[model samples]
Target: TTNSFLKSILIFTILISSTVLLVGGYWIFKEMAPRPKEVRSESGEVLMTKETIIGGQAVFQKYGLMDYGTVLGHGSYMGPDYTAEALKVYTEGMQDYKAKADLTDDEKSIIREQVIKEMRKNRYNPVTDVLVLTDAQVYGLEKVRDYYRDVFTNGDGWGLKKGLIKESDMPKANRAWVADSDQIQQIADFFFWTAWLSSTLRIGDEITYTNNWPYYEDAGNTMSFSAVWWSGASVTILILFIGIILYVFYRYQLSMQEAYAEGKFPVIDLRRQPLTPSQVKAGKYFVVVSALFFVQTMFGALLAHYYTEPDSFFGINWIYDILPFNIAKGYHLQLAIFWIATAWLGMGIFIAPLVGGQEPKKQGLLVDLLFWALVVLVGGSMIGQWLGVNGYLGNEWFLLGHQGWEYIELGRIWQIILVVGMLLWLFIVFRGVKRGLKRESDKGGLIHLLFYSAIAVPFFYIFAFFIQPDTNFTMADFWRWWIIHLWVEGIFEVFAVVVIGFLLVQLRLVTKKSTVRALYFQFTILLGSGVIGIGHHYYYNGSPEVWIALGAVFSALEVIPLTLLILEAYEQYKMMRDGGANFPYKATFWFLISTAIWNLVGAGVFGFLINLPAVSYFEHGQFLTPAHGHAAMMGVYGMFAIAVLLYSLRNIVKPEAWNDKWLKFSCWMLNIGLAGMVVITLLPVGILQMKEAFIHGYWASRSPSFLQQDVVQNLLLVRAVPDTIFLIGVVALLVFAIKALFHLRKPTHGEGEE
Candidate 1:
């Protein structure tokens, strides 16, 4: 009962941190919006309207160009950051107009100084919601329009592929159909507006809305004092919290030593457990999970070709017409979400009946229907995104096809189905875990944590509907980040720890009492930091400057609980060595240990690297983002899903037909291959690119010339080695899963029948 008393700290921690976070979050609603409803010249000449800018953003999303390039340095890096490109191009264009003739170096310097002086002056009248541009700005605006006209209407799609933008009123468009003359005009005006905001000082501030992101010095953009100060605070918080969390964890380890001496846990052979019908049905999920995981990895590899060969898929020209780089990358990301979701969903179904010690009569049928619904959600949404991205859906794309947001790209209809499915998931979990909770006397117990976190997954996911494509870019991104930042970094973190501890308790590797304490301690650290930590992403997303402080400081502390993974690894190692050798879950433990390594490095170390506002200001869309992404996604969540699948397989397949060696090899290969990827390719590429941003400007770093350097190109070629190994490992794991499914035997005589 005292554990209940102790556990209240977690709820309060979440409430307190979430409240503070919300206060700052509320500021985003008011201050983060870039909604200057009108744009005019100093002469009051109507230059553009809010409708055009909003339409341009829709154009951006509809074509899936966010995946192609970036704006405000917050999207994929394959193309130039649009804001940086616009700012630099406009300034340079203005430079030439002012000079009107060839210039000496000194003359060039004087002209650039004047451009910065004119550009950096804040000219937006916030009271009237209007931004007034000077005379030279219009010249620069026309120049920018012509440049994008050449781009969308030009070349072999930057060495990749080109499409239908030209067909509407051609300079030269290809399958790129979104940009008609009117659409081109809209996007151009939109681009110029961002260029103005990129350099124009914020009212009462020296930095632009992006905190001087894209690092263009010609236009007087640089790191702001607030951003730098917040960066320092983030680092300080990280160091201080690490020390505090380490000591607390050390004490936890010291206390557990007595019980862990030689192995205090019983060796429960999990192969002996009888499955409920739902549990048996969940085996089908592993098949789907492995298949999706396989396809996801292949697309991930294909994304590499997009970086290196940008012109075509492995030198085949026609493939780009159907499966464009953006669409391929979209599949890579969406497939990742689905495969992981499937495994997580299946794992919960299997474990529920075991935890409850009861199965409802219709539970199996319910699970079956949910699987097909998932099939519809996955199959339908994926096809919809392709059609939407390719212009097949036209205006209906937002509802029927790709919504064009990064992580949550499914159209409204599929999004609704997903939300509904999760609700069904919640109900099924309730029906299964309900009876077991009644038998237990512990109030607000371990099962409740699972249920609570599960509720959050669907609850927070509903926030995706908060904005539509027509919504202001800043406000739209705000809600999108809520879904992503809250789920993967927030509630999912809670779900992972609780699920692991629950399993350890079931396997008799740790007593439930000890798990309760460990979970409490770890979750306390997790929520305390994580809820507020989500602000780091908002630092440059048009949020108020205070978000830089909140994001940097609290997000830094998110790294603290990673220390618990070390303690967990140590305990798992000791327990397994003593009496767990014959245990079927050995493969599962290996994967868990891999999660520990990746979580610390990926989500912890590299994560903190990108969380500092000043650093993030420069490096937000750089290769470093993906470095953290891959490490966290594949290294932490990916390994966890595999472990769950393996656990499911061990539970269902005949004991004699199982081979831990296959799974163990696959796990090690995954780690080794991923290690090679981070070190050989991703880390080096990001370091060089980040260096360029810090030294030159964000625009220079993201330029085609920079990414096409000899060293960079060679790195992508060398990536082939790891990519191959990683694919082989995925293939191996899938084969093992397929083999296991084939060997999915019925219960032995006298087992379930008795």
Candidate 2:
């Protein structure tokens, strides 16, 4: 026993030491040493890293230019100017502004004097000087012939001009007399180049973009580009896809006891009622949300249709070319978030009554009302977005859209409502989970404590919302990743541990003591590695040098928790299958198997590929992102959701009602279709992205036109393969679902009758 204990301790210490060192290093690096440059503050809060500021600037540029009408009302700053000379200077690269003539010595000194005077007054923003110039200075004959005049005048000038300013003109008082056109351009080129370089390199205290909108310089003044909406879409999908899994787990606990009590062999000793407060809440939430995104999954194939043939459909607007691509896409994703939250809320309620072993005596109906109110709020918000009611109302004011980059920028009025909704959810879970679990022998208090801590991550978001804009890109990536990475990897990891461990115990697949032991150690394993693992997400994001060293090492360590968690789940499943009691159908097997696949592919293979900072540099913003996302969802959350649904279905309906043949067949279809998707979507498209990244470093201003002149044409071909495979899968699922719905038979066995 002594030898075994020492060996176990040695092994455990080794597993945990790396993460401990990493976390300690980060905090020490963050806190002890003074930063060489003064940190920039946004609103009031200081961001974690400098790259985040640039990302925020990128978003500012995107909204100002892409959503011009919205920002136009703010008279302080003009909307984005995509065609501005300043914007183009970086994107198209060091243009030959001197492509045309030279000047005298006296003129050069004069021009320098004037530029210096202007720079001092305008706090060194050269673009400001350009913007504030006299009409004559701006509209001179030399620049008149240029195509870029439209950006400055807001389209006031119609067309045509030449010889506006000759070298001999009155600026002999300035540099015009002696300086060649090349000399003047050379100076202008330096300023623009330095300004952009400062921001990208995280040099200087603050870097400002004067004509920032639609695009900003990424690779110094050498290349400026605007992100396609598809970029944000990719991030949004990845975050939510991962987030939804933990969120669903949050819901399952609420209904655990109700499912048990309503089982053919009811196990939980219920003193109150079978459908207790928690169970009822879970049922209502599940029923309502099932109507929203759950049904929309039916249209996943419809959404896939456009990618298959973009030119074929032009239904709503005559200008499909310029119209926002798939307005419903946002609606679909947002609805999924709200519904999943609802389902989790319902599940929490179900678990409460069972764990508490009493009637849900307090605030049961009130919590139910709160849940529905959230549903109503979500509906109205969607409608408001559709109708362009871009103002704040009631408590929904906090999310006011401003500066174009606030992720949930509704007005502060609506923001409050959203916050209230969050508070209510927290309140219900706390009150219900604590009250319901009070009498139970299970580890309810510990689980609730972990769950609450995980949920508290949003509090950091509350802080980020109020912070002011800072030096470009510095705070942009820092704060943004704080929200995305922390929640997905940090807090959500906590939730996953608590919920998954709890489920294994509740199902009698593992003893509570063993589950707790595994989970307690997992806590340090994830935090040490996972928090620093955030660096991987920053690999290609224009972050500084340390990212590669820290990112690769820490991200690699993050794989440990996921690997262990999946292995734990598989072990639990094996024990239950062998013991032969709880699993209701072959669908259960499919669901559990899906989770194993999810852990391996979604978290393992895809994760491993991206974890190496070097490899990630090529795959970061590309289609390989979705390769990981789809696999993980189909494998993990998708499987778990089905598992939860089966258990929940038993509470409201009977298991015998389900068509066993169709149930097993649907599982086969999901696996087969998903397998095809791995090859069809990930392989070809991943190669395309790798090739693109290789030819043009990931940060290029424009997609490389070298390989295949038109990137879109190439993208379409890549999309078509998966579209075909996924469509067939969707059809199969629909046929199967219809059969199950129609054929559900009543159970012959009842309480004490089996």
Candidate 3:
């Protein structure tokens, strides 16, 4: 009891420390800065508060990309012009693909090649035509109009056209059809000119095209920009690094040659226990939710493609708008994230009772209903988002910036539901904590504590979203980053540690004392050092010197725990083989190792390099972020989650699933392929983007010649290669998980089953 109490106290201390850092840092920074100016909506509604503007200006000016022209809207194509055409060409060609039994292999091959060639031909165009625009670009367009009015009518500054458009009527000329040919050409010229101006960051090839300014809405749909070479080199290095690591791992693992050789590990099966009806039901729920999440993932991938190559596959219509916000993609992304979390939480609930050797006291149909209800609610909201429904709960929702801000401001219904689910989860763990105190010898309580603390730390900060209101930035820009950054860089870290740490201890790969100690030290390292690590995000967002300093400090600290976790995990794995057991916990070990690899790339390379305020100035909002996200999630959390689920399922069913060669190998394939996917997808493409940003200003209003950059355009169109690799990994993992679930057989009851 004393030990358990001490552990709880320690966890609480670390959580409090993190909160203090976050709140204190904000306050100190806020007070020292001058009172900010206010930016209002067209209706005079305050949009960007004075405080936020100061914060933004601080960060923007620090990064050097923070120009007045950069923040506001500037051009005709808020989206990419070439990527859009490339997509259209590719998608149109796909319709001719007859993979049905109605065609021969040669016929199919010819058709496929034809489609490929056509897509390749389209790639030579000036722009990708991808309709997706960074928040900066969209806003930049608006700013462009503002600038046009100011320069030409008001003559506030930057007088390019001395007496052209009136400020009030700027929006009128902004429309392509509203202006005459000469006027339309002027607007188009302005658009391409700005894009070219923003092209100063490109480090690759340069190309120029004649008077093809109005690329999207007008006849001469061509633009030009210079490129830089350094981007590709950086990506090449990363790819080589990943390839080397995977090669080393493959060689070492396969070198054994024999499966469970003569001096093999001990074969004691601790999970040889009978399952209750509820456990069975929980398992089913896990699989169903996982499937839906996978469905969502598919759409997210497509949505990404839409962003890269706009107007390529489908013409701009209600469909594009609908797909971006509505449809399964939007719903699926949210559902996928929530459901995966639900499954883990649900599993945690069931595990608590099993470890206690008692029937579920409070668990019931109602709690089960909560899980399903959550699925329905989240799914429904996403559908609303898809179908153009505003304010999910009601229109009276709070309005701040845009999107969900108003909903959060209006009420906490969704928040309440989420917390209720969490409380139910806490209750389940609390039961285990109590039982663990009573039956100290069981060690189940310690195992559960590791995961509980991991999850709780992140959950505590969930209130930061709506509890504090930010009016300085757009909802799209400011609020979403809070959730995204907090989830990806904050709570998810806790989740990864606890889930993997618990499974390791439970499987006897590591001791309870060792695990607890690691947990304690790791949590300290994370909060003490990791809290400020979030400052890295502010590099380009427009913050002050204090933020950069704090970010630098925290960014360095972020790696300590990760390094510790990785080292401890590897050592534990080694110890397992040294033990009497011939076959070490194969699947779990692999997953953990995979998680480590993920951390290395996602948090280690990308994070470390970009954490510096200077590096992030260029890499912050580019493909680099996605590259980091893919590496971190797939490599770390995804791998850990898969491992934990597998271990739990194995323990519950005590089935022969683990014995299957295909299942285990599939696990290997998944980790390997996914790691590879991160390399191929993020590395080369990110490099191209990095080049785009460095030489072309990625989204700035200075360098505009990126339109004719061949490599950027080609990289934009050739996304299918990495997407294919990604699909392989997804399919393999899904198939393996499903096959294992179906093959599970009832286990013989044991004393451990209680």
TM-scores of all candidate predictions against the true structure: 0.94, 0.63, 0.64
RMSD (CA, Å), each prediction? 3.2, 13.0, 15.8
Q: What is candidate 2's lDDT per residue for 456-490, written digit by digit as tens?
A: 63454564453333332333444555555564334
In order of TM-score, best first, we have 1, 3, 2
Q: What is the C-alpha lDDT of each candidate?
A: 0.76, 0.42, 0.45
What is the C-alpha local distance difference test score of candidate 2?
A: 0.42
Better of 2 and 3 by TM-score: 3
Residues 1-754, candidate 1, lDDT per residue (tens digit)? Answer: 6576457887789789979977876777777646577887778887677777876676677777777788877777788887888887788888877766478888888998888888788777777988777777777887887877667666324643454342233223322324333776777667776676667777887677767766778888778898888778778877887887778677665222323445455656555666677887888789889999999999888888778878677678677777777788888888998898768878888788877776766788788988999999988998998888766665567787777777877888888999899888878877887776777677656787777776777788888889796676776787788777877554447776677777776766566776777777777887788778778877776777777888888878877777566766776676667664676678888888888888888887877777777778778888888888988989998988888888888889888888888777798789988888988899899989989888888888988888789998998779889988888899999999887767786633211221
Q: In model 2, which range of ten residues has the least summed lDDT?
A: 69-78
In model 2, where do residues sit more than 4 Å from their true spots? 1-93, 98-273, 295-323, 326-329, 362-364, 387-415, 436-473, 488-492, 540-543, 579-582, 585-589, 659-662, 696-754
Q: Is candidate 2 or candidate 3 better by lDDT?
A: 3
Clashes of each: 12, 70, 73
Q: Which candidate comes out best when scored by TM-score?
A: 1
| CA deviation > 4 Å runs, candidate 1 | 155-160, 166-181, 250-265, 747-754
Could you arrange the candidates by lDDT from highest to lowest?
1, 3, 2
